[PDB]
């Protein structure tokens, strides 16, 4: 009728939204869909570690004690030449402290 004869605007169609003004927004993500979850930043390693005191694990500053030893390992018995289980004749018995009177094990160890 009047006020709506020629100019007929039908803007309520469910498929489109109309409320985004149909201006597309070809991007407007700022991350430009490069990943989006890329700028979160958890642990991208900004340095290498954090501290890096001795660079590549340098224990040899100048405190080489080794009074305890343990540098050639050898977890297989002891000695690799003469050996002991090939005779076992220790004439050195001047070692005390050892309560070797109950070395029969029993159940007291």
Can you characterise this structure?
- The chain is mostly loops and 109 residues long.
- The protein has no helices and no strands.
- The radius of gyration is 42 Å and the shape is rod-shaped.
Offer a quick outline of the entry.
Helix content is 0%, strand content 0%. With 109 residues, the chain is largely without helices or strands.
> How does the major sheet shape up?
none
Gyration radius, rounded: 42 Å
- What fraction of residues sit in β-strands? under 5%
Number of helices: 0
Supply the number of structural domains.
1
Shape: rod-shaped
Helix fraction by DSSP (H/I, runs of at least 4): under 10%
Number of strands: 0
| Estimated structural class | little secondary structure
- End-to-end Cα distance: 111 Å
Subunit structure: A connexon is composed of a hexamer of connexins.
Family: Belongs to the connexin family. Alpha-type (group II) subfamily.
Modified residues (Phosphoserine): 104, 108
Subcellular location: Cell membrane; Cell junction, Gap junction
